[PDB]
Amino acid sequence: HHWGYGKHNGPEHWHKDFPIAKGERQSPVDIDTHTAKYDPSLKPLSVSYDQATSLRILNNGHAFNVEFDDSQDKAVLKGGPLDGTYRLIQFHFHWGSLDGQGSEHTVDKKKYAAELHLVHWNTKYGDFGKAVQQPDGLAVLGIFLKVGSAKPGLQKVVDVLDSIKTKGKSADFTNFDPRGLLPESLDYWTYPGSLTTPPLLECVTWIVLKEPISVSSEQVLKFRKLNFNGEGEPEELMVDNWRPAQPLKNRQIKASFK
Numbered sequence: 001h002h003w004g005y006g007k008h009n010g011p012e013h014w015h016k017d018f019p020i021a022k023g024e025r026q027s028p029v030d031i032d033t034h035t036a037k038y039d040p041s042l043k044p045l046s047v048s049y050d051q052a053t054s055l056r057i058l059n060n061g062h063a064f065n066v067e068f069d070d071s072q073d074k075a076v077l078k079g080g081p082l083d084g085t086y087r088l089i090q091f092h093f094h095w096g097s098l099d100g101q102g103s104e105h106t107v108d109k110k111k112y113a114a115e116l117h118l119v120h121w122n123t124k125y126g127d128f129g130k131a132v133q134q135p136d137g138l139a140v141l142g143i144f145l146k147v148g149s150a151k152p153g154l155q156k157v158v159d160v161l162d163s164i165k166t167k168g169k170s171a172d173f174t175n176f177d178p179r180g181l182l183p184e185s186l187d188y189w190t191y192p193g194s195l196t197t198p199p200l201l202e203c204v205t206w207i208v209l210k211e212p213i214s215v216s217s218e219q220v221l222k223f224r225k226l227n228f229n230g231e232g233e234p235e236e237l238m239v240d241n242w243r244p245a246q247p248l249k250n251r252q253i254k255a256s257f258k
């Protein structure tokens with residue numbers, strides 16, 4: 001009985017094996033655009049993905065991960081609410097069975113068709129492992145996806161999904177440039193949160209971009225063709241692999257824009 005997104009192992013069940021699920025700084029959260037406050041103290045955000053090196057893509061039975069070589073200081077995120085340097089280790093998506101849902105974070109309760117998460121760990125901690133043991137060990141850049149025009153930079157990921165249909169499958173995936181997944185504006189909302197999947201560790205400084213990127217219906221449709229199950233097992237389409245908004249509690253969401 002592993003955690004998942006179904007009726008018996010979904011988000012409402014996670015708290016049992018991971019009690020932190022009802023903790024003080026859980027993610028995602030609804031972003032009330034009116035209560036969020038512009039924060040002058042925020043330094044401009046710096047996203048340097050020019051030397052990013054993807055290695056492979058994997059279907060972990062929950063979503064698919066495009067992994068990067070974080071052994072050197074290549075793809076890094078800095079500035080903004082962040083202190084020091086954060087290194088890109090991987091990115092993945094959360095999407096729905098329908099365009100009307102899929103994103104984890106919401107803006108004034110609005111749910112986007114999907115959400116992109118670029119995961120980075122604080123280099124002051126050496127590696128990813130030691131970083132997820134720190135309140136500021138991680139920084140995740142979240143980008144909303146809506147259905148409309150196709151996103152050219154995403155097609156390479158799309159055409160490769162066929163090779164990793166089922167849980168456990170992986171395929172080499174080099175030279176993928178994540179800069180092709182970024183919207184025009186770096187305007188964002190930021191707050192202290194956690195991983196949205198178990199172990200739901202509260203080590204994350206979330207940075208959610210205001211401007212969503214648009215992908216085509218055909219692109220998101222292929223995401224939906226993926227499987228939760230492993231090869232040779234009953235087909236369970238990989239859809240609605242998103243955790244709903246959690247209590248904001250003792251927190252304030254700051255805006256990088258006025």
Ligand SMILES: NS(=O)(=O)OCCCCCCCCCCOS(N)(=O)=O
Pocket residue numbers: 117119128129132140194195196197198199
């Ligand atoms: N293997 S290790 O010791 O180096 O580290 C274990 C960490 C376990 C947790 C891994 C979590 C990885 C991110 C999952 C998605 O999070 S989200 N959706 O972006 O909030």
Ligand SMILES: [Cl-]
Pocket residue numbers: 006007236
């Ligand atoms: Cl199901």
Ligand SMILES: [Zn+2]
Pocket residue numbers: 092093094117196
């Ligand atoms: Zn995620």
